[PDB]
Design a binder for these strands. Structure first.
Ligand SMILES: [Mg+2]
Ligand SMILES: [Mg+2]
Ligand SMILES: [Mg+2]
Ligand SMILES: [Mg+2]
Ligand SMILES: [Mg+2]
Ligand SMILES: [Mg+2]
Ligand SMILES: [Mg+2]
Ligand SMILES: [Mg+2]
Ligand SMILES: [Mg+2]
Ligand SMILES: [Mg+2]
Ligand SMILES: [Mg+2]
Ligand SMILES: [Mg+2]
Ligand SMILES: [Mg+2]
Ligand SMILES: [Zn+2]
Lengths: 48, 70, 119, 134, 76, 175
RNA sequence: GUCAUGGAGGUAGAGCACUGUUUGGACUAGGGGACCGAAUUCAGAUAAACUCCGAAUGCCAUGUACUUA
RNA sequence: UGGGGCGGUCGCCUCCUAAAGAGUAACGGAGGCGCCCAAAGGUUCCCUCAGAAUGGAUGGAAAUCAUUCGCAGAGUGUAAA
RNA sequence: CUGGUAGUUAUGGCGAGAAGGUCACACCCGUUCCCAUCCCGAACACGGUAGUUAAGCUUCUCUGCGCCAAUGGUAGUUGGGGGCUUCCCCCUGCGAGAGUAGGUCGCUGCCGGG
């Protein structure tokens, strides 16, 4: 169930952040609005 | 009274077959009538059964079973 | 038999909850507000010394003209702002007082803000 | 035979018996008591033997109060076991008695039978005692 | 034949600076679990409940209401 | 406000004369009606709770709030937070409207009522009245209603003791 | 090293205000056509893993005090 | 390793031993861990528990209501402090 | 005199009894508007003052509960010395807990009305 996941920026394509989720309660790819160091602004990140 | 969640509500007129006391009251059933009693609140009349002034303890079908004997 | 709740007691409880974060220092005094059924009051307070600096009220000599009970709040707010500004007070922290920042309190705060007071 | 119904912990330290008794050094319920003059451990079997020997003499007359109880427990090792490998299994229950404690009570009988019953009980205990009056 | 025999290494709690001792900003004054001592003036509480000075000064362990204590730092 | 008129016109100074209250506002006044259906039997049944919901909604006119379970006990096959019972709170004009519709219309059709014990109170100024079926109220008919649950109707009175609450209920209507 | 001043810390002792262990008396919920017996109270005990309290020492500092390396 | 073998243990967290700063051993006395949560995190606003008695009761020792008393006798994802 | 707002370990609290007022403060009336209920104008929010001191609030009296609290004595104990060493005794310094004499129905600061 519990697994490691990595978050990738939808514009740059850089895998910036890592985190974990529960695979049963969250079968879909999670999405979050984090801060992207390359662009130096906030973008949208998706699980790979 | 939050809008939408609540059902319908409106005062009506309650009448008994024994006392005929049209006593204005609120309810959720329209009873599908229109009476002019209590002018300004001409709410629909609601037919009813034995009331306060109809019951022995309160104040003071089976007909067929008298058709055969009598 | 039911014991009716005491509005002022719970109001003071909420005021004490608010006051845990708001402190009236000498450079940045505290703007306390009290609201009744008839009228509203305001006081500028410092906590390091425990003394008030400016005040205004609906029942004061000024602000004689009145309207619905939000215009009295605006008037008392602008009068207290003018009195504080005339004494050199510019930066304050708004002490809500355990009320909600919605009605009379909000109008008083905006009236104070539009004058020379950085709330 | 007095044994506690429950204990929070099975194994206990042995403790010490320094100083006078914390409390209970005056006779309260009855009119005659058996007061320890020195300190010792008292198992539950000794209490049972003393109580039996003291009640039989009065012929089920009067009342008797037991002022001590065996809260503590002690362990032991069998013959032929080396040292170590944990603590031993508990064996019995003891009541650490300090000096000055009054630990038996008599009421409802005259001078002579009470004194003789206390004397008979005092020979079953491993501690020097004396008989006191309220 | 023993089910016991295990423990956890000590965490060295207690007080690290004495009352009346001059203190440098940002230094730990008390390591502790929960809140046995509350943070007073010019002092804050860490993530794991340690108390650290925020400005240079002199340590003083005052008393709050009846059954609890606090520590403060006063500049020179 | 016909029942408001009946209460205010003659009940208030009758009470004032009877008990010689020092002021005008020691008079007990009806304050709250609370309804609890007690549908805890529906451990797994989902239509029973819902059916109680529309039953209460029709009888009162306000949306009933489902109540959760305070604790979790295996003796009655329940866990934490299970939806148990209903909750409706009338207040204001609904006091007198519901009291009218009950004591004058719905109550008299009960089978063999001959009064309730004056000691069947809480002893401190309130009253809980029980009904053994849902057909006593004229608004809910027989065809729609499937089962009957004996619910609880409470009377909240500002009376400082019990005797004046009892006599106040008598003066307004049935004890 | 001593003296004066300020602190953190709950051991010895003691105590029953919490948690365990526990004695005698009164009454009793509950079951019983009187008998066991939950909870309340009175009086009396007990505790390394109990605490409404709580020392002597030791410890950390301050001093401009007096000696000493 | 109170000779060695058989038995048990080997890393981390909490309490007692531990002698009122910190530290402190024994094949000494008791327990847990090798996770979980997309809200069980952040912020703003609001409020307060266990239990007992009385009445309706389908429904009893115990479900859901109403009043009174009630400083925590509850809760704090999980072992203890 | 009263309203608002702070400091101080309840000597400030709990409980009991009396008095007061529409100057203030509340109860109170209402839900058109802003706003709100896992339902309910109860609360919150808004608009008003016919009635009230019944309660909130203020003042006054007490020792019933609670709380604070000596002096003397005692346990314990650093240093030194003795015994018949489950432990005990003597000299000097420190010195409790419990119990009690006694104290308490608060004391202070600022602003606005009378
Ligand atoms: Mg540890
Ligand atoms: Mg944190
Ligand atoms: Mg963390
Ligand atoms: Mg001890
Ligand atoms: Mg030490
Ligand atoms: Mg230590
Ligand atoms: Mg070890
Ligand atoms: Mg293990
Ligand atoms: Mg006047
Ligand atoms: Mg409207
Ligand atoms: Mg105190
Ligand atoms: Mg003394
Ligand atoms: Mg003392
Ligand atoms: Zn990017």
């Amino acid at each position: 169930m519990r697994v490691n996941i990595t978050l990738e920026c939808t514009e740059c394509g850089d895998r910036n952040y890592i985190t974990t989720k529960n695979k049963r309660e969250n079968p879909e790819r999670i999405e979050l609005k984090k801060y992207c160091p390359r662009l130096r602004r906030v973008t949208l990140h998706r699980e790979t | 009274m939050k809008t939408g969640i609540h059902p319908e509500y409106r005062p009506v007129v309650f009448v008994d077959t024994s006392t005929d006391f049209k006593f204005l009251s609120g309810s959720t059933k329209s009873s599908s009538e229109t009476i002019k009693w209590e002018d300004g609140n001409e709410y629909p009349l609601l037919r009813v059964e034995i009331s306060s002034d109809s019951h022995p303890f309160y104040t003071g079908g089976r007909v067929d079973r008298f058709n055969k004997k009598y | 038999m039911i014991t009716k709740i005491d509005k002022n007691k719970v109001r003071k409880k909420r005021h004490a909850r608010v006051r845990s974060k708001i402190s009236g220092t000498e450079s940045r005094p505290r703007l306390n507000v009290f609201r009744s059924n008839k009228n509203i009051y305001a006081q500028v307070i410092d906590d390091v010394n425990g003394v008030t600096l400016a005040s205004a009220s609906n029942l004061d000599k000024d602000f004689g003209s009145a309207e619905s009970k939000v215009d009295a709040a605006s008037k008392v707010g602008e009068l207290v702002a003018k009195r504080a500004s005339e004494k050199g007070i510019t930066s304050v922290t708004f002490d809500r007082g355990g009320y909600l920042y919605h009605g009379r309190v909000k109008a008083l705060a905006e009236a104070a803000r539009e004058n020379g007071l950085e709330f | 035979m007095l044994v506690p119904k429950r204990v929070k912990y099975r194994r206990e330290f042995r403790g010490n018996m320094r100083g006078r008794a914390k409390g209970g050094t005056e006779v309260a319920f009855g009119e005659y008591g058996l007061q320890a003059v020195e300190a010792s451990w008292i198992t539950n079997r000794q209490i049972e033997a003393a109580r039996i020997a003291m009640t039989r003499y009065m012929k089920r007359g009067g009342k008797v109060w037991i002022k001590i109880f065996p809260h503590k427990s002690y362990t032991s090792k069998p013959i032929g076991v080396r040292m170590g490998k944990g603590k031993g299994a508990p064996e019995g229950w003891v009541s650490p008695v300090k000096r000055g404690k009054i630990m038996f009570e008599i009421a409802g009988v005259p001078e002579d039978v009470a004194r003789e019953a206390l004397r008979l009980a005092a020979h079953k205990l491993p501690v020097k005692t004396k008989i006191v009056k309220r | 034949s023993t089910s016991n025999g295990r423990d956890s290494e000590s965490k060295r709690l207690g007080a690290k600076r004495a009352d009346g001792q001059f203190v440098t900003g940002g230094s730990i004054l008390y390591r502790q679990r929960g809140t046995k001592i509350y943070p007073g003036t010019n002092v804050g509480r860490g993530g794991d409940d340690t108390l650290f000075a925020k400005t240079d000064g002199v340590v003083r362990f005052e008393r709050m209401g009846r059954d609890k204590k606090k520590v403060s730092v006063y500049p020179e | 406000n016909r029942l408001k008129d009946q209460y205010l016109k003659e009940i208030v100074p009758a009470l004032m004369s009877k008990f010689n209250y020092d002021s005008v506002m020691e008079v007990p006044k009806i304050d709250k009606i609370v309804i609890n259906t007690g549908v805890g039997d529906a451990t797994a049944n989902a239509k029973v709770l819902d059916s109680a919901v529309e039953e209460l909604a029709l009888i009162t006119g306000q949306k009933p709030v489902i109540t959760k379970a305070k604790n979790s006990i295996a003796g009655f096959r329940l866990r934490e937070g299970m939806p148990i019972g209903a909750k409706v709170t009338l207040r204001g004009e609904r006091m007198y409207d519901f009291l009218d519709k009950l004591v004058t219309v719905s109550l008299p059709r009960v089978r063999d009522f001959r009064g309730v014990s004056k000691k069947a109170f809480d002893g401190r100024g309130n009253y809980t009245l029980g009904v053994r079926e849902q057909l006593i109220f004229p608004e809910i008919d027989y065809d729609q209603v499937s089962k009957v649950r004996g619910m609880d109707v409470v009377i909240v009175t500002t009376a400082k003791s019990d005797e004046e609450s009892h006599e106040l209920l008598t003066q307004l209507g049935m004890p």
